[PDB]
Amino acid sequence: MGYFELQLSALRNVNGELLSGACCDGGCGHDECDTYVRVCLKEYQAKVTPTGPCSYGHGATPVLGGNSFYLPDQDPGLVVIPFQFAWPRSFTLIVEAWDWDNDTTPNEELLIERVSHAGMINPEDRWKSLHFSGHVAHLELQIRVRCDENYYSATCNKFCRPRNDFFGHYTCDQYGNKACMDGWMGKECKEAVCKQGCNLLHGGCTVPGECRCSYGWQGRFCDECVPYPGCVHGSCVEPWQCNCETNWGGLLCDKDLN
Ligand SMILES: *[C@H]1O[C@H](CO)[C@@H](O)[C@H](O)[C@H]1NC(C)=O
Ligand SMILES: [Ca+2]
Ligand SMILES: [Ca+2]
Ligand SMILES: [Ca+2]
């Protein structure tokens, strides 16, 4: 999840001319072109065609000026095209200028200039400056790709939101990697580091620094086994044993054999 930004900085149509060779509204007069800009974003093309759908998204500006201008809480000279898919890095950018004419009709003949640029851009880079010269107009503009908050990587598809609750305990680093908080481990940082010395063959923990023993083991580090209940002069090696000392017998090692 991310967005593509284009910042228009300059545009010149000295003659007040459209691409078809007519005046917008001796020179071309004084009723100037009422200029606005469209941005088409589509797949990368070896040969860039004017036709084709904007399969990556599109945008437009309001009318910004007459024949020539620079720019300069909503910026009219900035086109933002959000996207959900993974950013493919390579792309075709088509930028068109238009005269608006106060007519509910879609008159295509009102096109001023069309420029294009096939290339590669990553979110890591910042504003790339692009200069264009057509038969009519000269454009100057910057472009940028940014990931939304908690999205990372060159595709803007790697997700990481910090979390400290029922499902995990971690922050995020520069590149979207989970950094487990003090006392947690595992790929999703939901697995706790038990206190040190805890034999984890027979121990476990829900909370960092804890170690409770499996059935049949005991002790602080859960490294000591549980003798058969009632065992007197006997000891344990594996749980539930009662191995007698010398001259002692019985199930509980309580019978004097001397
Ligand atoms: C369009 O121009 C103005 C708005 O800019 C409007 O008042 C006028 O009626 C319109 N003219 C037409 C449709 O010829
Ligand atoms: Ca016109
Ligand atoms: Ca005009
Ligand atoms: Ca016009």
Numbering used by the authors: 27 to 51, 60 to 106, 124 to 309
What's written in the study?
The Notch signalling pathway is conserved across all metazoan species and plays key roles in many aspects of cell biology including cell‐fate determination, stem cell maintenance, immune system activation and angiogenesis in humans (Guruharsha et al, 2012; Bray, 2016). Aberrant Notch signalling results in a number of inherited and acquired disorders, including various cancers, and it is therefore a key target for therapeutic intervention (Hansson et al, 2004; Groth & Fortini, 2012). Both the Notch receptors and the ligands are single‐pass type I transmembrane proteins, and direct protein–protein contact between adjacent cells initiates an intracellular signalling pathway. All of the Notch ligands have a modular extracellular architecture consisting of an N‐terminal C2 domain (formerly known as the MNNL domain), a Delta/Serrate/Lag‐2 (DSL) domain, and either 16 (Jagged1/Jagged2), 8 (Delta‐like1/Delta‐like4) or 7 (Delta‐like3) EGF repeats. Binding of a Notch ligand to EGF11‐12 of a Notch receptor results in a series of proteolytic cleavages, with the final intra‐membrane cleavage by gamma secretase, causing the release of the intracellular domain of Notch (NICD) from the plasma membrane.
Here, we present the first structures of Jagged2 (N‐EGF2 and N‐EGF3), which has only 58% sequence identity with human Jagged1 (N‐EGF3), together with the longest known structure of a Delta‐like4 ligand (human Delta‐like4 N‐EGF3). Two crystal forms of Jagged2 (N‐EGF2) (green) and one crystal form of Jagged2 (N‐EGF3) (dark green) were solved, including a total of seven crystallographically independent copies of N‐EGF2, and 1 copy of N‐EGF3 (N.b. not all of EGF3 is visible in the electron density). All of these copies have been superposed on each other by alignment of the DSL domain, showing some flexibility in the hinge region between the C2 and DSL domains, and further flexibility in the hinge regions between the EGF domains. The Jagged1 and Jagged2 C2 domains bind calcium ions (shown in red), whereas Delta‐like4 and Delta‐like1 do not; the aspartates involved in calcium binding are not conserved in Delta‐like4 and Delta‐like1. The C2 loops are ordered upon calcium binding in both Jagged1 (Chillakuri et al, 2013) and Jagged2 and contain the amino acid ligands for calcium binding although the number of calcium ions bound differs. Interestingly, the three calcium ions bound in the Jagged2 C2 domain are at equivalent positions to three of the five calcium ions bound in the Perforin C2 domain (Yagi et al, 2015). The α(1,6)‐linked fucose on the Asn‐153 N‐glycosylation site in Jagged2 packs against Trp‐151 side chain (shown).
